[PDB]
Amino acid sequence: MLVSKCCEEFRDYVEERSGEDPLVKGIPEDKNPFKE
Amino acid sequence: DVQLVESGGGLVQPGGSRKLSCSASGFAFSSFGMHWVRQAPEKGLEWVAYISSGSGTIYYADTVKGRFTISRDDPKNTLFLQMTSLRSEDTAMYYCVRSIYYYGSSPFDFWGQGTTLTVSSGGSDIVMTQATSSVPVTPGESVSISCRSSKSLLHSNGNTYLYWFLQRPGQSPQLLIYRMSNLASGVPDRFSGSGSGTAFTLTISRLEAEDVGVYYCMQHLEYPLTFGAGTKLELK
Amino acid sequence: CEVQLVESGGGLVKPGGSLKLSCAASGFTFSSYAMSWVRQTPEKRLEWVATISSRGLYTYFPDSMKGRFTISRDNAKNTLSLQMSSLRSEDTAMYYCLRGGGYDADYWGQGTTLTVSSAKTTAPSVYPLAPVCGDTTGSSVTLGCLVKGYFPEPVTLTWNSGSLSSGVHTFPAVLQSDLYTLSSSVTVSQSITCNVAHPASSTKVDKKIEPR
Amino acid sequence: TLSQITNNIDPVGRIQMRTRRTLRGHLAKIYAMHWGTDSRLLVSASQDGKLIIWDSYTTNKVHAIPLRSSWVMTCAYAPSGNYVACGGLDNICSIYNLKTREGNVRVSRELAGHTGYLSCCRFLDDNQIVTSSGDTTCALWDIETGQQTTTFTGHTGDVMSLSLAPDTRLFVSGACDASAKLWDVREGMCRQTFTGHESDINAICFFPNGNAFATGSDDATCRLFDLRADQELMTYSHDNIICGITSVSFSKSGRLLLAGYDDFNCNVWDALKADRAGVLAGHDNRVSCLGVTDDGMAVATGSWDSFLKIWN
Amino acid sequence: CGTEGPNFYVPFSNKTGVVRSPFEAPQYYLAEPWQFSMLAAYMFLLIMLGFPINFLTLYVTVQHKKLRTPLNYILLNLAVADLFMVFGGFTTTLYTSLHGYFVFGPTGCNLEGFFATLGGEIALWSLVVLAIERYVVVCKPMSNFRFGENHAIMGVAFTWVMALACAAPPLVGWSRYIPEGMQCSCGIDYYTPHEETNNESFVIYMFVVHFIIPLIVIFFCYGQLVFTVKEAAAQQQESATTQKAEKEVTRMVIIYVIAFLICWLPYAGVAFYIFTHQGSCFGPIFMTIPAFFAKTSAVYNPVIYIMMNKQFRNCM
Amino acid sequence: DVVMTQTPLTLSVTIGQPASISCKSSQSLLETSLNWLLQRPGQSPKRLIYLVSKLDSGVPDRFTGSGSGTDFTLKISRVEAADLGVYYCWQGTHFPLTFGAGTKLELKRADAAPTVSIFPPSSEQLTSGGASVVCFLNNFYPKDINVKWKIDGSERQNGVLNSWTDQDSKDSTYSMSSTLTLTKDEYERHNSYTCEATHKTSTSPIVKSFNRNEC
Amino acid sequence: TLSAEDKAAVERSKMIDRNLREDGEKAAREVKLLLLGAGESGKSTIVKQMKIIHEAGYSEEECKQYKAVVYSNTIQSIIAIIRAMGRLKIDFGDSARADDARQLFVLAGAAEEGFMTAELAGVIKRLWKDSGVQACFNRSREYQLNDSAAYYLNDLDRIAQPNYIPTQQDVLRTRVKTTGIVETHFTFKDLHFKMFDVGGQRSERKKWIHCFEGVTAIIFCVALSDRMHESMKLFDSICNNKWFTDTSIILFLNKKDLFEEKIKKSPLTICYNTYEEAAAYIQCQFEDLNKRKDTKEIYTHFTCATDTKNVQFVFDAVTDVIIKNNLKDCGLF
């Protein structure tokens, strides 16, 4: 079991996570409790 | 083991003065806010006064400001009530109530046995309405009591500040629901609460014997704290 | 801690009557340990009587029976007393006194049996039973004597003044109309007479096996 | 290797995270932190003998508990939020109930039996907790009854820190024999052992599916190890970085690897492309610890400079 | 002796009719234009030394945030103070001495006198507070104290309190700000009488609170500090670095004291000789020696405490 | 004052496997202050288990106290001769003795052959105008057995009076004398009176009959 | 302004905060002394004997810090006894003690360390004298009860006196066995000292650079009479390690009697006559091991008991180091 298969699983898990990550997608401040 | 023992009650002539005491044990007395709630003879509960932990914050009912003094002796774990200009309308059962405030806390979670005061002869607040004063029920059935407020109890922070209490006949009140959806410790899972904004419902499934009493909803969004008139569940 | 408790005073009593049951306490200090009373019906249901503290500071009675049966204690002579009143036939039970409460119920006494019935010392009703029929498959026939309407309970059944006891099977008395129904049968020229006797009062009724 | 596999995909580019809160009140070095499962509460440990739990949303201290012994090296939050586990040079793991037990302290259990310092601990549920100690052993304790009920032996040197699998049925440990060992919690034994670092291994964390993990070492490299392929997949080392690594954590997608360096910086690496994606600065001393909320919304960093920073 | 005015006093007899208003004529009859040439050039010199140094200090503090410690607050205070001396003093004096007479009116006279005295007092009490802080920290007299950023802030505020408590009263009517010397520079009227403003009581208050007390405090504090350091060096006779530190600290304390004496004993001696020898009269030529010594502190307080500080030589 | 009930009355369990007696609880008064009291036949009831782990005097150690939520468990690997008798479960936190239905704990034995006989009514009883047709059935247990009265092909259940033994002194079975107590008029209305014992694991019922022609 | 009910949570946070500030003021003044060694069969035991012989110990003032621990032990014991009295339903031999028992719960608010009026003492003596309390206590084997219950209760007079000084057995029972902090807080020249005896040698550095740093002073014990060259090489590596660059090294050359006999009969050349040349040679070999720093300020003392020129030396070195480190961060040098 070679590397590219495990790397495809790491990709396909990373990929549809931008809509949850507030960093790579970034975040609007009304959609975030980090207002001061 | 949490204990609250009120004393100092009795019959007093109007215009007189009276100091009530509430003795706390088995918990960090100085860490709790404290409230006074009273109940006129054949009437519901009405909140009277609040003193924060540390005495930094004090609230009075309008009918009592100027006349009543709330105080605490935290080192001696003792609560005081200095009364003056006692009126006939002050006649009530008086409960001392502990209330700790922090993220996720359960205010109003322990009540004393209460002390009775009898006085001899001689608006902006949110109104909560329980239009049905009593309901006949039979064991095993399921009931739903409703209450509504003239203003939304849902706050801009997302919380809806609604509490349900039960006073069975002859006993001190017991917390049922805190913050609209949290089940109080010791309460059976046959109770559940729901609602939206200005209209709310408490539902019991397979109503049992012990379920009989008066059910009050209450808002803790802002002071003065205010109760509903109460809805009684009678057996058929 | 071998606790010595003797229950006594139970016996014949009429419904609604009064009696003074005694628990003699020995082998332990009376006034420093709590005491309790329990009563049991033969019908497998319990009937708990009382619990009193070591010196009587706390005493609790069952919700069903509070105020009817009363407990007291004599600390100087080390004796527990139980006064008995407002009796009904259901109170027919044997009583045990215990040291402490159920929280420390380590030993139980032998108990004394108190039977509630308005009947006095009455002669047992003696009825011969010797049908020799339908037993054509077996080798021996069963004879018997029926002890009916009899009280105090039990009243012993013997054959020829206690001479015969082998192979004898006795049915436990069934109570109807406050009178007991028992039958004792043995499967077996000599005089065959069932003597139904209460040796304590020597109350004896002799009935010979003769159709009449 | 993942690095030579992902070369074709586009880089992440400008990762500009900002400090949204500064939590003040500690008066000495912070040695540990742990996110609660609500991604809001956190616990921090300081040599002032206090363990403080903060509500990160309002900037309120929920509790500051004064500890009887100040020589703490590890602490843990039960996933239920009901318990913490605080260690010390006393070789004892003290358990504190944060939710059902009303108020302040009494200790219900002191887990005693290790013969060296408690180096790490992680709760499974309100029942069972896995711990490591300088005595070269690891142990699963039944806290209620107080006995070491399971024991994981086979390391030949001091055990440094531990990481629970996402389902909490397995755990992996890293030690100063420069090895990590995978242990079966319920079977009480080591399935596999991975060596290769020449250094003590100071840090360990998991890919979110529990199928891979990353290590951080004093040998100035980080390495990614795969369980099912049973070997190292990648090394992360600038040639001019010779200092130790103190801490690692994944972003919600696993894409970001945050690492603290003796050089006073917290570099944020693209875990897929091995490029540094961003930097966490603002500290006057080594970043000693960090963590990502389970929901991914925020990262906390803790430092030898006595400060914590919250980023998003 | 001098030409008495309401808002001014020119130390030059009008019996000849030559004297004029300090708001009016170029005072080229007090001294030949060469004297004002050197005056202006020297003022430009001190501008082109003070602002370089004083701005660069701030810039460096901005660049390196490691220096933002409570102990360093008072040197930032010094920098600010000296920028006041640069702008409130030298530039507006320049634009008047270039002409011979004070252009901006009595309100510009008040602004100059005020801002000058304010800066000088901020510097004075900044040095007093730094010595007091170091005394408390090292000698530990109370031995139950901590001294945090809060105390440094209170110290700075107190320095601003005293500076205003000195520079502002001449703006409302207790003594007065008037053109002194060549009448291009405005300052306190310590040299004439004026019963409306109670000059005697004001001068005595000034002489005692903003001179006598600072000197007493500095002498006492450094004396106790030197006693402590000498004693410490005494116990570890074989510890080389403590004996070296002893010698260096004593060197530095003496430098500090001599700098302060150089800075203020001119004014002290002049005012005292005015006080006891009332029968006398001096003109601008002799009246600008103390002004010289005071203005030049804008250079060598930054030198002695910022350039010479061994934590700042490493930024150069 | 709710009662706490033990279930079942009799727990027959296979050898080796855990045997569970479930006490269903009345009130939440919880320490673990629950007690099992046992009466053995011929002996005063004795407290057996108190405070979950504290053994009382004279009590077998094989009892195990356990449970979950609101239900409690008495676990025994094998019910033995000391375990036969009436058990009551009571919470020792609060009084009185909660009167449970009691576990009549004893091991279920193999089916035994009943001794069954029929008896005509006595002449002296007929003198009083009554007739009692008797059927003796000894050593018949467990309940997988029925005593049926048959008259002229029709099942009869009315007029039946039972005199039953207690738990028998030999094998603890059931033994009953079952009598059709009727008027002599109804006794003479019919000819054959029969008692039949029908058994579950035995295919052959026992028939005891009598008629006026054959006694 | 979403302050609703919350301005009570805020109030709590500021109240905890004032407390946090107060603990901090007390802290930081401690002088921490670390006893190390044990890297052999008995090194730290030699260190302990060196502490006993040359650093005294067991004063009245340190004993005074154990009063609250004694009281706390006493309190859990008496509460356990009282609750068991309530649990078994045992009544007083005299009903007037029922009032005492009520008073007992009231007077149990007197838990103000060291307020030992005759009235409280008499209340405890009377409760302890009650026959129901003695009856429960002698059956303590039926529940859980500290074995020291009788020990403390029978000696309450001596322990509760305000001049009470804990004995060695009292201290040893306070659960300070094994490892085990080994602590004392004696007072000297108005300074509160804290000394900690730990071990770890040749290789335990990773755990105490990991926890010991910023500490006030190290007490480094050396066995003077100590493949021998690989051991010397290891010692060179630890003592001279770069991670210990900014730590002052203080040397207690201990076991000087054994060292003096050993150098008398076993020559120093094993490692690399009279005392002076061999001691100077050892100093030269050790001091040459630095090679990277301008100075270390090592304070070497030649010691006899604690009643000789030793206590002054230790307090002098602590004071000069604190002073020099206070001047190090004031712009001066």
What ranges make up the beta strands (E) of G74-216?
183-184, 187-188, 191-197
The answer to whether the beta carbons of residues C129 and C183 sit under 8 Å apart is yes
The answer to whether the beta carbons of residues B41 and B11 sit under 8 Å apart is no
Can you read off the two tokens belonging to residue D120? 């790490």
Q: State how beta strands B115-119 and B10-12 pair.
A: parallel
CATH number (domain holding residue B191): 2.60.40.10
The answer to whether the annotation marks E278 as part of a ligand binding site is yes
Same domain, C107 and C139: no
Among all residues of chain B, which has the CA nearest to that of G112? Answer: B75
Query: In the complex, which subunits touch A with 3 or more CB pairs below 8 angstroms?
Result: D
Which residues of chain C have a CB within 8 Å of the CB of G102?
none
- SS3 annotation, G319-331: HHHHHHHHHCCCC
Resolution stated for this PDB structure, in Å: 5.2
HSE toward the beta carbon, residue D45, CA cutoff 13 A: 25
Residue D147 CB contacts under 8 Å (≥ 6 apart), including other chains: D141
Q: State how beta strands B78-83 and B92-99 pair.
A: unpaired
Same domain, C140 and C37: no
Whether G24 has its CB under 8 Å from any CB of chain D: the answer is yes
Same domain, C148 and C169: yes
Q: How many domains does chain A have?
A: 1
Q: Rounded to whole angstroms, how far apart are CA atoms D206 and D250?
A: 8
Helix axes E199-207, E240-276, angle to 10 degrees: 170
Region of B127 (left: φ > 0; alpha: ψ -120 to 50; beta: rest) is: beta
Q: How many residues can be counted in chain A?
A: 36
CA dihedral of residues F93, F99, F105, F111 (deg, nearest 10): -170
Read out DSSP for F179-199?
Answer: EEEEEHHHHHH-S-EEEEEEE
What ranges make up the beta strands (E) of chain C?
4-8, 12-13, 19-26, 35-40, 46-52, 59-60, 70-74, 79-84, 93-99, 112-116, 125-129, 142-150, 156-159, 168-170, 174-176, 179-187, 193-198, 203-208
Q: Rounded to whole angstroms, how far apart are CA atoms G292 and G307?
A: 38
CATH number (domain holding residue A24): 4.10.260.10
Residue G84 CB contacts under 8 Å (≥ 6 apart), including other chains: G136, G140, G143, G145
Query: Residue E56: exposed, middle, or buried by beta-carbon count in 10 A (0-12, 13-18, 19+)?
Result: middle
Query: Residue C157: exposed, middle, or buried by beta-carbon count in 10 A (0-12, 13-18, 19+)?
Result: buried
Can you read off the two tokens belonging to residue E296? 């030049």
Which residues of chain C have a CB within 8 Å of the CB of G98?
57
CATH number (domain holding residue C190): 2.60.40.10
What's the one-letter identity of residue G269? T
Question: Containing domain of residue B108, as a range?
Answer: 4-119
- Sign of the alpha-carbon torsion through C24, C27, C31, C34: negative
What's the one-letter identity of residue D5? I
Q: Rounded to whole angstroms, how far apart are CA atoms C146 and C184?
A: 6
Question: Where in chain D are the domains?
Answer: 1-312
- Number of Cβ within 10 Å of residue G205's Cβ equals 16
Region of D13 (left: φ > 0; alpha: ψ -120 to 50; beta: rest) is: left
For tokens 């009563």, name the residue.
Answer: C39
Sheet holding F130-140, edge to edge: F115-119, F130-140, F174-183, F160-164
In a domain, G91, yes or no: yes
Can you read off the two tokens belonging to residue D14? 């400008």
For tokens 């000698």, name the residue.
Answer: E139
Q: Rounded to whole angstroms, how far apart are CA atoms D172 and D206?
A: 9
Secondary structure (3-state) at C125: strand
The answer to whether the beta carbons of residues D255 and D2 sit under 8 Å apart is no
CA dihedral of residues G108, G114, G116, G117 (deg, nearest 10): -100
Q: Rounded to whole angstroms, how far apart are CA atoms F66 and F64?
A: 6
Active site residue G5: no
Query: In the complex, which subunits touch C with 3 or more CB pairs below 8 angstroms?
Result: F, G
Q: How many domains does chain G have?
A: 2
Query: Residue C203: exposed, middle, or buried by beta-carbon count in 10 A (0-12, 13-18, 19+)?
Result: middle
List the beta bridge partners of residue B183: B177
Domain boundary among B65, B86, B119: B119
Q: State how beta strands B174-178 and B182-183 pair.
A: antiparallel
Question: Where in chain F are the domains?
Answer: 5-105, 115-210
Q: Rounded to whole angstroms, how far apart are CA atoms E275 and E267?
A: 12
Could you give the domains of chain E?
A: 3-307 (1.20.1070.10)
Can you read off the two tokens belonging to residue D264? 């006073």
Domain boundary among C88, C116, C144: C116
Same domain, C101 and C34: yes
Q: State how beta strands B58-60 and B115-119 pair.
A: unpaired
The answer to whether the beta carbons of residues D292 and D310 sit under 8 Å apart is no
In a domain, G253, yes or no: yes
Q: Rounded to whole angstroms, how far apart are CA atoms F100 and F89?
A: 6
Q: Among D59, D146, D53, which Cα is nearest to D98's?
A: D53
Give CATH superfamily name and number for F5-105. Answer: Immunoglobulins (2.60.40.10)
What ranges make up the beta strands (E) of chain G?
31-35, 183-184, 187-188, 191-197, 217-223, 251-254
CATH number (domain holding residue G316): 3.40.50.300
Query: Residue E195: exposed, middle, or buried by beta-carbon count in 10 A (0-12, 13-18, 19+)?
Result: exposed
Which residues of chain A have a CB within 8 Å of the CB of D295?
20
Q: Among A7, A1, A12, A2, which Cα is nearest to D5's?
A: A7
Residue G264 CB contacts under 8 Å (≥ 6 apart), including other chains: none
Same domain, G195 and G310: yes
Read out DSSP for chain B?
Answer: --EEEEE--EEE-TT--EEEEEEEESS-GGGSEEEEEEE-TTS-EEEEEEE-TTS--EEE-GGGTTT-EEEEETTTTEEEEEE-S--GGG-EEEEEEEE--STT--TT-EE---EEEEE-----SPPEE----EEEE-TT--EEEEEEESS--B-TTS-B-EEEEEE-TTS--EEEEETTTEEPTT--TTEEEEEETTEEEEEESS--STT-EEEEEEE-SSSSPEE---EEEEE-
For tokens 């009583």, name the residue.
Answer: C95
Q: Rounded to whole angstroms, how far apart are CA atoms D85 and D123?
A: 8
**Active-site choice (G30, G40, G94, G236):** G40
Region of F149 (left: φ > 0; alpha: ψ -120 to 50; beta: rest) is: beta
Same domain, C110 and C163: no
Q: Rounded to whole angstroms, how far apart are CA atoms E276 and E280?
A: 10
Secondary structure (3-state) at G130: coil
Domain boundary among C51, C85, C116: C116
The answer to whether the annotation marks E35 as part of a ligand binding site is no
The answer to whether the beta carbons of residues C39 and C18 sit under 8 Å apart is no
Question: Containing domain of residue A12, as a range?
Answer: 1-35
Cα end-to-end distance, chain D, whole Å: 30
HSE toward the beta carbon, residue D220, CA cutoff 13 A: 8
The answer to whether the beta carbons of residues C98 and C109 sit under 8 Å apart is yes
SS3 percent helix, strand, coil of chain A, rounded to 5, is 45, 0, 55
CA dihedral of residues C124, C125, C131, C137 (deg, nearest 10): -40
Query: A touches E (3+ CB pairs < 8 Å)?
Result: no
For tokens 């279920």, name the residue.
Answer: F108
- Number of Cβ within 10 Å of residue D228's Cβ equals 10
The answer to whether the beta carbons of residues C84 and C114 sit under 8 Å apart is yes
- Number of Cβ within 10 Å of residue G243's Cβ equals 11
Domain boundary among B119, B146, B179: B119
Domain boundary among B89, B119, B149: B119
Active site residue G175: yes
Can you read off the two tokens belonging to residue C54? 């070591």
The answer to whether the beta carbons of residues E113 and E7 sit under 8 Å apart is no
**Of the options 3.90.245.10, 2.60.40.420, 2.130.10.10, 2.60.40.10, the CATH number for the domain spanning D1-312:** 2.130.10.10
Query: In the complex, which subunits touch E with 3 or more CB pairs below 8 angstroms?
Result: G
The answer to whether the beta carbons of residues A29 and A35 sit under 8 Å apart is yes
**Measured between alpha carbons, how far is residue G321 from residues A3, B180, E241, G248, G326 in Å?**
59, 62, 11, 9, 8
Domain boundary among C116, C144, C171: C116
Among all residues of chain G, which has the CA nearest to that of B99? Answer: G8
Question: Containing domain of residue G229, as a range?
Answer: 31-64+178-320
List the beta bridge partners of residue B191: B204
Among all residues of chain D, which has the CA nearest to that of B104? Answer: D99
Same domain, B114 and B135: no
**Measured between alpha carbons, how far is residue C212 from residues B4, B153, F120, F185 in Å?**
83, 95, 16, 20
Rg of chain E taking only CA atoms, in angstroms: 22
Exposure string of B66-90, with b = 16+ CB inside 10 Å and e = fewer, is eebebebebeebebebebeebeeeb
Active site residue G308: no
Same domain, B136 and B91: no
Active site residue G45: yes
By what method was this entry solved?
cryo-EM
* F97: nearest CB among C44, C48, C107: C48
Extract the annotated binding site of G for Mg(2+): 44, 178
In a domain, G306, yes or no: yes
The answer to whether the beta carbons of residues F186 and F133 sit under 8 Å apart is no
Can you read off the two tokens belonging to residue B161? 């500040």
* G91: nearest CB among C53, C101, C104: C53
Same domain, C46 and C111: yes
Can you read off the two tokens belonging to residue G224? 């003077």
**Measured between alpha carbons, how far is residue C11 from residues C4, C96, C111 in Å?**
21, 14, 11
Same domain, G132 and G60: no
Q: Rounded to whole angstroms, how far apart are CA atoms B204 and B216?
A: 14
Q: Among F53, G140, F93, which Cα is nearest to C103's?
A: F93
Same domain, B64 and B166: no
* G16: nearest CB among D64, D89, D158: D64
**Of the options 1.20.58.340, 3.20.20.70, 2.60.40.10, 3.90.1150.10, the CATH number for the domain spanning F115-210:** 2.60.40.10
Same domain, G305 and G270: yes
Q: Which of residues 234-253 of E touch G (CB under 8 A)?
A: 235-236, 239-242, 245, 248-249, 252
Question: Containing domain of residue C97, as a range?
Answer: 4-116
